[PDB]
Design a protein around this ligand. Structure first.
Ligand SMILES: COc1ccccc1-c1ccncc1C(=O)Nc1nnc(OCc2ccc(Cl)cc2)s1
Ligand SMILES: COc1ccccc1-c1ccncc1C(=O)Nc1nnc(OCc2ccc(Cl)cc2)s1
Lengths: 741, 741
């Protein structure tokens, strides 16, 4: 029975699955897919190692709930990078059968309407908003499927509560129409202890497996000795060519057998240092002093807005490199592709890669059990060591955690530890959000229904607050009480529409209302201070640098600075030689200055030099700001603020792509980010109309010029040759202008 | 030879001309059209009575310069009403042959680009801007024809100088490429003395005729005696049924022969009184106390935003009525159509109708020679008395000017007077505008060329200033001087682009620049104070009323009022119980309040009641404000002001149609002004897409409802039946959404 052809499956999807290598399932997937009425709608909650092909069952169930019972489906993923990778994977897997798959990730939204879509690959943040939209204007009948990758995220997380709110709201909808399902829910999780609780909460069937196609050997390293998980010595490591940790010797031993290695370091500078070191030894140890593919990778990295990196330049032409959050998303994807193809053999990465893309390595060396001054998380450790072993290539996979002295204790604790149980995280902001979501959607009106809703949440399954939440929403004019039936107000409806926390929406309302009274239209800084999310921790602000920039602003910026709350007596002044709101204003002013250079098309390296923030932080900030701009635009649209929504309607795109207004029509093309559109705009093409018939060979020449074979790198298309790149550019322009009218 | 078939002419245009009755030309038209090389391009300047078919030669020459030498053409007309009538006339005459004819009048602009057009029926104000646009971005080769109706307007006028600037600029272009024409110029004028001078100035051939198809008998009336033009008694008038002027007796005598009468009064109240009087007598004198078509006219007047008029209600169902500027444009057109069809037999009109549409009456009675406290203009008198006599119906036409005592002297002076010679009207604002127009267009650079240009104007043909104009443009940063070659600046380029006087553009620049620093986005009043043209004399502002409105403004308006300069200590206060800029601000604030109710879709009668300004003044103000809004939008667009042009980009439409934002897509339909779109919007149609397939019979029912056979009145379509009206509405929506993509 274990064969993808025996199971009912489209021929096109079957032949696409044979391309990636999936031709015979495992026993665990069959036992999970044949777990009673799961194929009919009885929700499903299952756990498996990430290397065991967890998502195959989810994709099969989607194809089912989409083909047989034609309806929409949601694929909720934890992060934007993995969500985009899954969106492109599902697109390449489902294009032939005609299932329109599009993504709601970060700032990007599908050009086509959600009604035209058939699968929405969403982040946790945007899937909740999508379901809120479906509930508001009565379309919950379109949804028939919801898939939640990384179900364990529903516990303690900054975006996990939105996951719970996503399901407890759906289940109520299914359990209020009952006065094998109407909306199926399929969840993928890790080896959680209380998975059952989660399975019973969602009524889903529970499937837990521990099968790993490539066996895993986790071990600790103390001095020169290697011990297994159960405090048993397994090997006496002796360095081959070393100049205790012998990290370089371990990497050398891994490399000698024509394999690759993952090296998880606790910081960025540590990754850059511990990739330089192995590069130096691989030169000296291997030169007594594919290439072509590696030179292609170097040239791909060299035609980027930030260009080549000095440490990358020293490391990459030896098989060694580093992959941390400091690099741009393009550089990170290039390095990840190079490692995936075997071109890069040693990858010094941080913990961020552990939860990100699927990047398996033969040996995973975790330098220290102490990550960022704290012991490594058991979930993080499991995520790292689950990458040890490539399916279908390696016979085994090795994880080596390097510990010492006392550190040995934390290492053995990580070796013998297990995942913590899932939580609920639900007065509190999450419960306020949930109460507002149900009341404003009209799904629940009376307080008896309000407690019934809380009887459907994970808190009720794990085993007052709702009254406090209702009181808070009533006292803050989010909700009105009539003979005590609760009805949404205009502010309460606008909060649920623009997907913002009701806690933040109060100050957002105050800030926008103050901005309407006095606005500065002679720059884009006032329209940016409103769409600037916060400071958070996107960078470590240098006070002197800030004051210097401020001393050199146009004769019109400081007008915007003083109209929003910034000062000069406290503007990188007092803090220069050394208040919770003024700090949040200046740290928002600086943040709004950086975005000012992002929408002014300033090169990332120049922004880094003038502001001191690296390019990864700048890109993260611009993505967050674009999301916030979209939310603020919807908030003003639903409040009847036509003179502000009109101003904000373009800044989401101008921040997503970091462009000027002129390119806002060119960047609609998927392959025109901010530099293949500026060089294509200077040559006279200023509209997607002039680019549909743009001379093919002409745009090839233009893309060949202006360099900061497949040197051009495209997000989701990896590397593209100039000719193929601009051919796809003109084809995308043709499709955009042809299917939008 | 005198036959429209013998002349080379399209068969479709010939059969369309036979519809209006034009089947045999006069001798004067043949002698003017065969005046040497006029048919080849030698410009043409000719004079004829307005009843002699002056424009036939112009239309024939256009068809020529359009069919043979395919190129664009301009039809410059003095006013918006006559320009629109001519646009619809030329459209109905030229649709079959395929000559795309569209109008640049007031605020409306063609949906299609000027390149697609073949005839542009423009006002004098907008034709100059069109020619400036053609000269700027090098398209003067498209223009090959320019037709100027009412050439005598080029002298002393508020829009006449723009006419001269229109031609002296063209001639230079033709006479600078010479270092039978490249742009033909055809002018129609009245019996001017210095026509020759104008003919030689434009190099045009001169044709003057005095032929009138219906002979005219002008006479003066003193007491009971009627004297001819040369102080000779012609008839001893005796009233038939009178209760000296015997105006009513004269109207009765005209009516008894089943004819109609035009009665030109010096004011609006006089027209309303002297139509009520003849209505009263036509009831009492004719009732000892077509109908169906007249009841149709009453119902047409009753389904208007202002509804029926009390004086109109008393007068119209007797054949008598009044036509003054106080009425709406729709009411004026309805009354003019009723008089033209013979339904209305006595029309008490003001001097405004004299220069407007072609409305002939058998007898034209001019009550008094003193019009508005001053003697009647000889041009105005000729314009009035040229309407005496319908071609093809009457055998003669009669003009009767009622004078008395001393007034007799001014009456005989008008009888024996003649038209004053044409002037030039060119430091002065016109010469500044002309110098800026040539320099910024790049057509002239050196001061030698600058004096050469002034050697091409009408001043040079009638027989220092240019140096003063250049100095003024240099000292005001409109123009820069290099090694002394004059180049346009950004402000100088923006002034020529947005078609505003350089005198006004300085204060406009200052006002917009001040508005960018602090703007109020929570209402539309700040975006309206910038697009409010001026006070001029559009109304007589009532101070108490203004202060009352101000005492009752939202909690956000007075914010806009104090941000622009308005006060409360001087805001219908001091002037209430009884400074050239503060007067221009408050009179702009009040004007910006009225427009606020126009874009809020307040009914015209409610605006009239709350502000004290009649509906004709309100409509004139809204048209002027829409023109100003378009000019300001272009001015900000060319100055790189993206945050202001975006705000202003919709107010031109919102003021042209007096609508809200929601209807800005519906009013793109030619038959949806502001009340056939609001009632069609409330039923769910909020987009021109929902109206293309809008159920035909459904929109018929919706238009049948909401009444404030052909009751629906459409501008340019006269009266339309509900079924035909909404059928044309859905057809226009289909065309709009089908040909715009
Ligand atoms: C505020 O909404 C944003 C808009 C722009 C960018 C980011 C956000 C955002 C930010 C932070 N968290 C969440 C969101 C979010 O996506 N909320 C959404 N709500 N509705 C959406 O459209 C989906 C949709 C539309 C129509 C139908 Cl019929 C069905 C589904 S997205
Ligand atoms: C400022 O321009 C306004 C815009 C809106 C409404 C009123 C005005 C206005 C107001 C007062 N006086 C004059 C104008 C005026 O029409 N100026 C114009 N200039 N260019 C135009 O377009 C014609 C055109 C366009 C492209 C080509 Cl290739 C050739 C011709 S219109």
């Amino acid at each position: 029975k274990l064969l993808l052809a025996n199971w009912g499956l489209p021929k096109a999807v079957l032949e696409k699955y044979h391309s990636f290598g999936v031709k015979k399932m495992f026993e665990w997937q069959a036992e999970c897919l044949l777990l009673g009425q799961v194929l009919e709608g009885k929700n499903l909650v299952y756990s498996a190692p990430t290397s065991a092909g967890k998502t195959l069952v989810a994709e099969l169930l989607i194809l089912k709930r989409v083909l047989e019972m034609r309806k929409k489906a949601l694929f909720i993923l934890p992060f934007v990078s993995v969500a985009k990778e899954k969106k492109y994977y599902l697109q390449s897997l489902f294009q032939e059968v005609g299932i329109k798959v599009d993504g709601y990730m970060g700032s990007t939204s599908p050009s086509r309407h959600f009604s035209s879509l058939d699968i929405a690959v969403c982040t946790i943040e945007r899937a909740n908003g999508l379901i809120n939209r479906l509930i508001e204007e009565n379309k919950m009948d379109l949804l028939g499927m919801v898939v939640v990758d990384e179900l364990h995220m529903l516990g303690d997380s900054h975006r996990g509560y939105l996951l719970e709110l996503l399901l407890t709201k759906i289940c109520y909808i299914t359990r209020k129409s009952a006065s094998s399902n109407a909306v199926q829910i399929v969840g993928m999780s890790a080896t959680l202890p209380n998975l059952e609780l989660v399975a019973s909460w969602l009524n889903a069937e529970l499937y837990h497996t521990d099968f790993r196609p490539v066996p895993l050997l986790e071990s600790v390293k103390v001095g020169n000795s290697i011990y297994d998980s159960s405090m048993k010595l397994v090997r006496e490591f002796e360095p081959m060519l070393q100049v205790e940790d012998h990290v370089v010797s371990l990497c050398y031993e891994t490399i000698c057998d024509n394999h690759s290695v993952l090296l998880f370091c606790p910081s960025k500078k540590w990754c850059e240092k511990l990739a330089d070191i192995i590069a130096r030894e691989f030169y000296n140890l291997h030169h007594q002093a594919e290439q072509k593919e590696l030179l292609e990778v170097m040239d791909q990295l060299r035609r980027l807005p930030s260009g080549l990196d000095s440490v990358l330049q020293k490391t990459v032409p030896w098989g060694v490199a580093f992959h941390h959050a400091g690099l741009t998303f393009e550089e990170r994807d290039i390095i990840e592709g190079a490692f995936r193809q075997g071109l890069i053999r040693v990858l010094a990465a941080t913990s961020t890669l552990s939860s990100g893309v699927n990047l398996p390595a033969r040996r995973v060396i975790i330098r220290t059990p102490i990550f960022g001054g704290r012991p490594l998380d058991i979930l993080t450790y499991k995520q790292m060591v689950g990458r040890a072993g490539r399916k279908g290539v390696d016979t085994v996979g090795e994880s080596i955690l390097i510990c010492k002295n006392s550190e040995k204790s934390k290492g053995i604790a990580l070796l013998q530890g297990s995942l913590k149980p899932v939580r609920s995280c639900l007065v509190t902001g999450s419960m306020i959000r949930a109460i507002l979501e149900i009341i404003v959607g009209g799904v629940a009106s009376t307080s008896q229904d309000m407690h019934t809703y809380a009887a459907c949440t994970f808190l009720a399954a794990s085993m007052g607050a709702i009254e406090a939440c209702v009181m808070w929403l009533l006292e803050n004019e989010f909700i009105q009480s009539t003979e005590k039936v609760y009805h949404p107000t205009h502010l309460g409806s606008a909060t649920l529409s623009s997907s913002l926390s009701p806690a933040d929406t109060l100050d957002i309302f105050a800030d926008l209302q103050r901005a309407m009274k006095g606005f500065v239209l002679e720059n884009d800084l006032h329209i940016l201070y409103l769409v600037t999310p916060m400071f958070e921790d996107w960078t470590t602000i240098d006070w002197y640098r800030f004051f210097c920039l401020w001393e050199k602003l146009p004769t019109s910026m400081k007008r915007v600075a003083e109209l929003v709350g910034v000062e000069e007596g406290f503007l990188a002044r007092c803090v220069k030689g050394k208040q919770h709101r003024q700090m949040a204003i200046h740290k928002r002013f600086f943040t709004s200055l950086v975005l000012l250079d992002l929408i002014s098309e300033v090169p990332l390296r120049e922004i880094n030099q003038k502001y001191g923030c690296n390019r990864g932080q700048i890109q993260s900030l611009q993505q967050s700001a674009a999301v916030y701009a979209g939310m603020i635009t919807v908030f003003s649209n639903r409040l009847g603020w036509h003179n502000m929504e009109l101003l904000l309607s373009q800044f989401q795109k101008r921040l997503t792509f970091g462009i000027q207004r002129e390119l806002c029509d060119l960047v609609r093309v998927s392959l025109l980010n901010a530099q293949r559109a500026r060089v294509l705009y200077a040559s006279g093409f200023h509209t997607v109309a002039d680019l549909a018939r743009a001379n093919i060979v002409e745009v090839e020449v233009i893309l060949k010029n202006a360099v900061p074979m497949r040197t051009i790198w495209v997000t989701g298309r990896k590397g593209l040759t100039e000719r193929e790149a601009a051919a796809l550019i003109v084809e995308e322009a043709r499709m955009i202008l042809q299917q939008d009218l």
